[PDB]
Amino acid sequence: SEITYSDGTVIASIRDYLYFTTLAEAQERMYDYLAQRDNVSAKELKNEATQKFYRDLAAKEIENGGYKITTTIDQKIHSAMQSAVADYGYLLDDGTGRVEVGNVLMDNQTGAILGFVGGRNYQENQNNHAFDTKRSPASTTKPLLAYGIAIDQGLMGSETILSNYPTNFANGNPIMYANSKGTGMMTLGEALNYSWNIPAYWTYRMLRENGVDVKGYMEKMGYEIPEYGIESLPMGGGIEVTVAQHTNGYQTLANNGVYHQKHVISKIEAADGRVVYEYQDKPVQVYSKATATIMQGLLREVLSSRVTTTFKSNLTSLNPTLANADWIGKTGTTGQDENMWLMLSTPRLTLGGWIGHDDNHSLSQQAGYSNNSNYMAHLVNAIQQASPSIWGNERFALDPSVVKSEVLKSTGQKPGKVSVEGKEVEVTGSTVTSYWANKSGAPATSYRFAIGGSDADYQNAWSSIVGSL
Amino acid sequence: SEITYSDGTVIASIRDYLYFTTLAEAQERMYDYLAQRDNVSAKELKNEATQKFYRDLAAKEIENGGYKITTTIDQKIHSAMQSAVADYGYLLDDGTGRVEVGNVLMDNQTGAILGFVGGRNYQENQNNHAFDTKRSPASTTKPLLAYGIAIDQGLMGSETILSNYPTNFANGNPIMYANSKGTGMMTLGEALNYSWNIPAYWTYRMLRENGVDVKGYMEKMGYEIPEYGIESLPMGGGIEVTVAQHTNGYQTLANNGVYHQKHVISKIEAADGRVVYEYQDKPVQVYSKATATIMQGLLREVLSSRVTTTFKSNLTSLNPTLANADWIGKTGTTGQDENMWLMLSTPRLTLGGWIGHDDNHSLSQQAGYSNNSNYMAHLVNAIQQASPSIWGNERFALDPSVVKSEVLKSTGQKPGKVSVEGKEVEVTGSTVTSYWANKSGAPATSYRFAIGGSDADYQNAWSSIVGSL
Ligand SMILES: *[B-](O)(O)CNC(=O)c1c(F)cccc1F
Ligand SMILES: *[B-](O)(O)CNC(=O)c1c(F)cccc1F
Ligand SMILES: [Cl-]
Ligand SMILES: [Cl-]
Ligand SMILES: [Cl-]
Ligand SMILES: [Cl-]
Ligand SMILES: [Cl-]
Ligand SMILES: [Cl-]
Ligand SMILES: [Cl-]
Ligand SMILES: [Cl-]
Ligand SMILES: [Cl-]
Ligand SMILES: [Cl-]
Ligand SMILES: [Cl-]
Ligand SMILES: [Cl-]
Ligand SMILES: [Cl-]
Ligand SMILES: [Cl-]
Ligand SMILES: [Cl-]
Ligand SMILES: [Cl-]
Ligand SMILES: [Cl-]
Ligand SMILES: [Cl-]
Ligand SMILES: [Cl-]
Ligand SMILES: [Cl-]
Ligand SMILES: [Cl-]
Ligand SMILES: [Cl-]
Ligand SMILES: [Cl-]
Ligand SMILES: [Cl-]
Ligand SMILES: [Cl-]
Ligand SMILES: [Cl-]
Ligand SMILES: [Cl-]
Ligand SMILES: [Cl-]
Ligand SMILES: [Cl-]
Ligand SMILES: [Cl-]
Ligand SMILES: [Cl-]
Ligand SMILES: [Cl-]
Ligand SMILES: [Cl-]
Ligand code: NA
Ligand code: NA
């Protein structure tokens, strides 16, 4: 029995992450095969005695048999990923103790996993941080569950305005971001580049208000969220994900909105060639192409702006020609710096990244902004050196079907009269193209122009807007 | 034109709360009458120009006409309520500035409002704190939205056990109560008497898990809650209510589960006797009688235990014979002592009570426990002196249909073997009657016995339980 890379080169016959991860998935596939083959009903398969016998059966069936398990893993790439974490993993240590890590590199067109990083060192710690451990995705939830959906429902567009004025959770506590209680109105791009929380809160509220099927979106991408009624959901509250699953969500946006399920096994077959298992592809249009490519545009600037990650500086210095590939991405940060994420894509690959501590104590303030950003730049450069064409040179581009409205920079809506405490006002001033994913684009400017805001908020907002005309 | 008390005695012809409150409701009733009479379609009634003309019409129609508006108000009672707040209202001032107040006294069998208190003094402050201002009900939400429903769905019973171990909101913050992060397991009665938050959190979660129609319950009682997906809902988060509306919810539990809509107007009629308006009664069985009378039992002890209110001590001293009537009740307290409530019933009346500040700054720590408790005791004694039989001498009593199970005091479930990390254990020790509102009563003891709790929680819990056998 052997496990091979994707070219058939043997990984091992039946002591690191690659081996145990591929062996485990293979055993799962063997278990279904065997239940079926023996005509075990999904009823009798609910007995835990029979389950356990079939799992041991599937294990021995691999040890003893002459099976050929074909993984998606790319051997040059996955080795380079291992060398990189061995050489540069110390760069994650931020003086809060040893920092753990997981990464998963995914082909955007197939869902196939090319290489991953399970942790700093299997021999010192076995936990698989790429495939098993589950942590809040934090703000990398935003592009998926809040803004992406709002755009796909045609409820906002790329230059739409949101409230980031102070507001509280229903319990009375203020919604914090770092240690800021909020500012004022802002565009979607500034909310994204900075990653503020209040714009996201208000976005999910608007989704709820319009009864949007938010679950439907998330389940099409294989996310399991037990409870959607949670004020902080769009910031990562009440969600817990593997790096492998989460990469798959960023693969959806990368791939112009088309989900392909993740996999590390493509095929199992007996020595005589019987196909015991075969990955069956199953594409799903989760976001409209308009949505996904507008979103790519915004995420490009998350990395260019360098607000919450230094990544592009780090990569520019290691590999300027690679830094000019069309990178997009989003960071995340939990409320006490327990977890940092960085999600990266080009049109070809998505690289997912998490760091944190196995027991969930805090990292330093900058573990995400700087350390993980620097580590990942090294990791990305290692992958490129090992396979020079793999990230590709293609550009993300707006899909023909995107609609483009002309809007006021200050309302993110079309100019036109509006009512302010008595008189109608000629709503005027500098303008910008906004990208929408509906039929009509952006609407007439109306008073409640932003996503969110209280009466005083708008009183203050409209005061400022007026004195500029 | 005149407004009368319920005996026909004239209040006024067309300068305090009584006048403006009764005039306002009467004008609303006149508006519907007139729209109808003139054959104005609910379409044309959506025009705000026509709305405004009909509201001015309805106002002049009262000034000019010879209408006889019959209120539910009891004249002796409502006067005594006004004297009481004038004499004793200074008892609310807790050194956080002038404290405002509202109360509403409701007949449990009719919904009729007998008397209310709009504030400390109309001449100094017009705001109607009984009928217009809206504030979180805080923990007085619990009996209605969390425990009452759980019991009515047959998901818990009176001695059922809940977790009050530490746990966080989905955002990472711990659920606080005063400045405690939690303790351990506890019975429903201790959770109620103390008013802890974590047992309620876990209760609403279990309701959500079983897809219970919680909205259905709350809307039958006339509550408008815009969003049910809120972790703190059962503690008062995301709800805002008048004292009049909230009294009506406590009227539902008082009246063995049968809602009657609140009203201050019973009848409007023209000089020649034409009935322009008549209150039409509309009873609804919101909770089963089993639920409502079990709940009465628990709420009796909220006041007897004197944990979160001194009320019974205060009343015992002013009027011991009245203190022996069968009082039940619940306090509430917002997260920064912005609002205090006390809800009181006997089988005949429900008295609702709020205090706080018009601008929502904090009250002192004890404004609810002590000051409002003392004020209300005075208010209740004033009402009794003015109408001696009005609170009545009846007892709340368990309804025949309540089921009574024998359960272990420590699991609040029936004794029987259970699995603890290996061996099966003879689950034993002292016992208690638990009251249920289903067909079967309490179930077999199983491992996850409490409402809520994490794996460690139960590890700790079961450790303690074991070493006692
Ligand atoms: B983001 O990581 O920049 C901001 N997100 C948050 O503050 C957040 C979490 F990461 C997780 C739960 C709640 C929350 F607000
Ligand atoms: B109760 O008033 O004793 C406890 N309730 C609360 O802590 C609470 C509120 F009153 C309002 C919102 C949230 C919350 F936890
Ligand atoms: Cl490995
Ligand atoms: Cl592993
Ligand atoms: Cl390979
Ligand atoms: Cl909070
Ligand atoms: Cl949903
Ligand atoms: Cl998931
Ligand atoms: Cl929901
Ligand atoms: Cl797989
Ligand atoms: Cl074979
Ligand atoms: Cl499309
Ligand atoms: Cl750049
Ligand atoms: Cl930088
Ligand atoms: Cl650790
Ligand atoms: Cl346009
Ligand atoms: Cl503008
Ligand atoms: Cl532009
Ligand atoms: Cl449209
Ligand atoms: Cl009055
Ligand atoms: Cl009034
Ligand atoms: Cl009267
Ligand atoms: Cl509901
Ligand atoms: Cl309401
Ligand atoms: Cl809901
Ligand atoms: Cl009324
Ligand atoms: Cl008449
Ligand atoms: Cl009933
Ligand atoms: Cl008592
Ligand atoms: Cl006392
Ligand atoms: Cl005030
Ligand atoms: Cl029994
Ligand atoms: Cl016991
Ligand atoms: Cl007993
Ligand atoms: Cl039953
Ligand atoms: Na972030
Ligand atoms: Na309380």
Side-chain angles (χ1 to χ4, degrees):
Chain A
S1 243
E2 14 184 68
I3 294 149
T4 80
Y5 298 107
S6 50
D7 65 1
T9 285
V10 173
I11 290 154
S13 33
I14 320 317
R15 96 278 335 293
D16 216 311
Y17 295 118
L18 180 64
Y19 184 85
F20 299 101
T21 306
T22 58
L23 181 63
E25 185 43 58
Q27 294 173 348
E28 257 166 62
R29 298 305 166 175
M30 189 63 64
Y31 171 95
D32 296 331
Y33 167 67
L34 300 158
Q36 186 80 66
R37 179 205 68 177
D38 295 2
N39 312 313
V40 182
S41 82
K43 215 154 259 164
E44 54 211 46
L45 263 169
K46 279 192 224 113
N47 199 237
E48 308 179 60
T50 93
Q51 280 180 54
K52 169 189 214 278
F53 164 82
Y54 277 89
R55 273 177 207 293
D56 177 72
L57 197 72
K60 304 284 185 307
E61 188 53 31
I62 323 252
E63 285 158 28
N64 304 333
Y67 299 86
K68 190 158 112 287
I69 313 187
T70 295
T71 76
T72 51
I73 296 296
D74 187 303
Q75 178 234 83
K76 252 123 225 133
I77 294 185
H78 179 81
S79 291
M81 287 177 73
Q82 300 327 286
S83 271
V85 62
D87 293 354
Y88 298 115
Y90 79 93
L91 303 167
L92 307 165
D93 292 331
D94 56 3
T96 62
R98 193 165 169 101
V99 177
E100 272 298 358
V101 57
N103 301 285
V104 161
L105 181 67
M106 193 177 286
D107 180 311
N108 279 339
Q109 285 87 10
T110 66
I113 286 161
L114 303 174
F116 64 88
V117 165
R120 298 283 293 277
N121 189 327
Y122 183 88
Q123 305 317 309
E124 286 303 326
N125 181 2
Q126 280 86 64
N127 279 129
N128 189 324
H129 299 94
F131 278 97
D132 311 336
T133 61
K134 283 218 217 228
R135 288 279 169 95
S136 174
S139 295
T140 59
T141 303
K142 271 117 164 200
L144 290 166
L145 184 142
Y147 307 121
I149 293 178
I151 292 171
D152 202 66
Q153 291 305 106
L155 300 179
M156 100 199 341
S158 75
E159 293 303 332
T160 282
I161 292 292
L162 320 85
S163 187
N164 190 61
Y165 282 100
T167 183
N168 312 310
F169 291 117
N171 63 28
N173 315 334
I175 309 196
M176 296 301 289
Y177 172 75
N179 304 258
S180 176
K181 296 193 123 213
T183 56
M185 299 294 189
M186 65 177 57
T187 64
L188 172 55
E190 180 184 337
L192 273 160
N193 289 346
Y194 278 71
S195 204
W196 292 96
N197 290 327
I198 306 189
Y201 165 89
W202 285 125
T203 301
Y204 183 52
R205 218 157 106 89
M206 168 200 60
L207 298 182
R208 302 275 301 183
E209 265 155 40
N210 287 265
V212 166
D213 186 11
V214 160
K215 183 192 293 178
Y217 285 93
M218 301 295 293
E219 278 179 343
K220 294 184 204 181
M221 294 179 286
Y223 284 104
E224 306 157 2
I225 292 151
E227 170 60 85
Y228 282 81
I230 278 162
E231 301 160 85
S232 52
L233 192 77
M235 292 99 97
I239 315 190
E240 249 201 331
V241 304
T242 66
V243 183
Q245 166 49 41
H246 201 32
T247 299
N248 209 161
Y250 277 77
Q251 169 275 327
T252 304
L253 288 167
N255 200 40
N256 317 317
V258 166
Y259 170 81
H260 300 270
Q261 208 189 11
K262 47 170 172 89
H263 49 295
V264 63
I265 308 304
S266 64
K267 220 200 236 248
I268 306 171
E269 73 210 305
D272 65 16
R274 268 163 316 154
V275 195
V276 163
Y277 177 67
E278 206 173 14
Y279 169 89
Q280 168 64 66
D281 184 47
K282 208 151 268 170
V284 168
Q285 187 82 59
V286 186
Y287 303 85
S288 76
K289 291 171 198 141
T291 292
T293 60
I294 296 176
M295 191 46 66
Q296 288 154 11
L298 287 157
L299 294 187
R300 182 180 292 119
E301 287 191 0
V302 173
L303 302 188
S304 285
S305 66
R306 298 170 171 78
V307 178
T308 58
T309 161
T310 55
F311 169 86
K312 223 52 197 300
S313 302
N314 298 133
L315 192 61
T316 294
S317 291
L318 299 174
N319 195 327
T321 294
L322 182 56
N324 286 141
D326 195 10
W327 291 99
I328 69 171
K330 180 67 186 89
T331 50
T333 312
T334 54
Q336 297 296 317
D337 312 310
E338 301 98 323
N339 300 284
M340 311 278 175
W341 294 80
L342 181 45
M343 311 300 293
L344 299 173
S345 304
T346 62
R348 288 192 196 273
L349 317 182
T350 287
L351 174 61
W354 162 89
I355 66 186
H357 289 301
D358 279 355
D359 71 357
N360 273 291
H361 76 269
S362 288
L363 297 163
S364 63
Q365 249 144 20
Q366 316 259 264
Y369 174 65
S370 176
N371 307 241
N372 190 43
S373 299
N374 177 41
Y375 161 73
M376 280 180 82
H378 289 283
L379 184 49
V380 146
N381 165 74
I383 289 164
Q384 201 271 335
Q385 295 310 298
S387 175
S389 292
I390 210 95
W391 293 107
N393 303 297
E394 290 80 17
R395 311 312 283 189
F396 296 109
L398 278 183
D399 189 78
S401 64
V402 158
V403 172
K404 306 191 204 203
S405 309
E406 278 316 286
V407 310
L408 307 153
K409 159 186 175 107
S410 86
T411 46
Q413 316 186 302
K414 275 187 213 145
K417 47 118 175 54
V418 139
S419 198
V420 195
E421 314 178 349
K423 307 221 250 223
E424 283 175 44
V425 154
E426 235 351 78
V427 190
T428 231
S430 60
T431 55
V432 73
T433 303
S434 191
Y435 305 132
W436 290 65
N438 61 343
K439 230 195 120 194
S440 260
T445 278
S446 37
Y447 183 74
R448 313 210 70 93
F449 63 86
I451 311 304
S454 63
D455 291 341
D457 293 333
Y458 282 125
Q459 173 157 347
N460 163 280
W462 279 109
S463 165
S464 211
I465 277 173
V466 133
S468 299
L469 329 158
Chain B
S1 243
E2 14 184 68
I3 294 149
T4 80
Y5 298 107
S6 50
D7 65 1
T9 285
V10 173
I11 290 154
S13 33
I14 320 317
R15 96 278 335 293
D16 216 311
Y17 295 118
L18 180 64
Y19 184 85
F20 299 101
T21 306
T22 58
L23 181 63
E25 185 43 58
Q27 294 173 348
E28 257 166 62
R29 298 305 166 175
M30 189 63 64
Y31 171 95
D32 296 331
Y33 167 67
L34 300 158
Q36 186 80 66
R37 179 205 68 177
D38 295 2
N39 312 313
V40 182
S41 82
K43 215 154 259 164
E44 54 211 46
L45 263 169
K46 279 192 224 113
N47 199 237
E48 308 179 60
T50 93
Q51 280 180 54
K52 169 189 214 278
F53 164 82
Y54 277 89
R55 273 177 207 293
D56 177 72
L57 197 72
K60 304 284 185 307
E61 188 53 31
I62 323 252
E63 285 158 28
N64 304 333
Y67 299 86
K68 190 158 112 287
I69 313 187
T70 295
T71 76
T72 51
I73 296 296
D74 187 303
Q75 178 234 83
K76 252 123 225 133
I77 294 185
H78 179 81
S79 291
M81 287 177 73
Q82 300 327 286
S83 271
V85 62
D87 293 354
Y88 298 115
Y90 79 93
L91 303 167
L92 307 165
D93 292 331
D94 56 3
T96 62
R98 193 165 169 101
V99 177
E100 272 298 358
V101 57
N103 301 285
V104 161
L105 181 67
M106 193 177 286
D107 180 311
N108 279 339
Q109 285 87 10
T110 66
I113 286 161
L114 303 174
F116 64 88
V117 165
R120 298 283 293 277
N121 189 327
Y122 183 88
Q123 305 317 309
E124 286 303 326
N125 181 2
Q126 280 86 64
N127 279 129
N128 189 324
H129 299 94
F131 278 97
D132 311 336
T133 61
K134 283 218 217 228
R135 288 279 169 95
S136 174
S139 295
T140 59
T141 303
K142 271 117 164 200
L144 290 166
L145 184 142
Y147 307 121
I149 293 178
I151 292 171
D152 202 66
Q153 291 305 106
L155 300 179
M156 100 199 341
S158 75
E159 293 303 332
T160 282
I161 292 292
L162 320 85
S163 187
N164 190 61
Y165 282 100
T167 183
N168 312 310
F169 291 117
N171 63 28
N173 315 334
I175 309 196
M176 296 301 289
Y177 172 75
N179 304 258
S180 176
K181 296 193 123 213
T183 56
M185 299 294 189
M186 65 177 57
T187 64
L188 172 55
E190 180 184 337
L192 273 160
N193 289 346
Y194 278 71
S195 204
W196 292 96
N197 290 327
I198 306 189
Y201 165 89
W202 285 125
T203 301
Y204 183 52
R205 218 157 106 89
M206 168 200 60
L207 298 182
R208 302 275 301 183
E209 265 155 40
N210 287 265
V212 166
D213 186 11
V214 160
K215 183 192 293 178
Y217 285 93
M218 301 295 293
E219 278 179 343
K220 294 184 204 181
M221 294 179 286
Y223 284 104
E224 306 157 2
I225 292 151
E227 170 60 85
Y228 282 81
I230 278 162
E231 301 160 85
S232 52
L233 192 77
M235 292 99 97
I239 315 190
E240 249 201 331
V241 304
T242 66
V243 183
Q245 166 49 41
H246 201 32
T247 299
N248 209 161
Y250 277 77
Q251 169 275 327
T252 304
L253 288 167
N255 200 40
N256 317 317
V258 166
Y259 170 81
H260 300 270
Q261 208 189 11
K262 47 170 172 89
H263 49 295
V264 63
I265 308 304
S266 64
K267 220 200 236 248
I268 306 171
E269 73 210 305
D272 65 16
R274 268 163 316 154
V275 195
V276 163
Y277 177 67
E278 206 173 14
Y279 169 89
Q280 168 64 66
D281 184 47
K282 208 151 268 170
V284 168
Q285 187 82 59
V286 186
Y287 303 85
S288 76
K289 291 171 198 141
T291 292
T293 60
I294 296 176
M295 191 46 66
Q296 288 154 11
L298 287 157
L299 294 187
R300 182 180 292 119
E301 287 191 0
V302 173
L303 302 188
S304 285
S305 66
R306 298 170 171 78
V307 178
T308 58
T309 161
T310 55
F311 169 86
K312 223 52 197 300
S313 302
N314 298 133
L315 192 61
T316 294
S317 291
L318 299 174
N319 195 327
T321 294
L322 182 56
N324 286 141
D326 195 10
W327 291 99
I328 69 171
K330 180 67 186 89
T331 50
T333 312
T334 54
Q336 297 296 317
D337 312 310
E338 301 98 323
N339 300 284
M340 311 278 175
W341 294 80
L342 181 45
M343 311 300 293
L344 299 173
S345 304
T346 62
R348 288 192 196 273
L349 317 182
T350 287
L351 174 61
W354 162 89
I355 66 186
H357 289 301
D358 279 355
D359 71 357
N360 273 291
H361 76 269
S362 288
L363 297 163
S364 63
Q365 249 144 20
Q366 316 259 264
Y369 174 65
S370 176
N371 307 241
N372 190 43
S373 299
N374 177 41
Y375 161 73
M376 280 180 82
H378 289 283
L379 184 49
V380 146
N381 165 74
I383 289 164
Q384 201 271 335
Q385 295 310 298
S387 175
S389 292
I390 210 95
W391 293 107
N393 303 297
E394 290 80 17
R395 311 312 283 189
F396 296 109
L398 278 183
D399 189 78
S401 64
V402 158
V403 172
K404 306 191 204 203
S405 309
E406 278 316 286
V407 310
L408 307 153
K409 159 186 175 107
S410 86
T411 46
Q413 316 186 302
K414 275 187 213 145
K417 47 118 175 54
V418 139
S419 198
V420 195
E421 314 178 349
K423 307 221 250 223
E424 283 175 44
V425 154
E426 235 351 78
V427 190
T428 231
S430 60
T431 55
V432 73
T433 303
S434 191
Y435 305 132
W436 290 65
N438 61 343
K439 230 195 120 194
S440 260
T445 278
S446 37
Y447 183 74
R448 313 210 70 93
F449 63 86
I451 311 304
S454 63
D455 291 341
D457 293 333
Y458 282 125
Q459 173 157 347
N460 163 280
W462 279 109
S463 165
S464 211
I465 277 173
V466 133
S468 299
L469 329 158

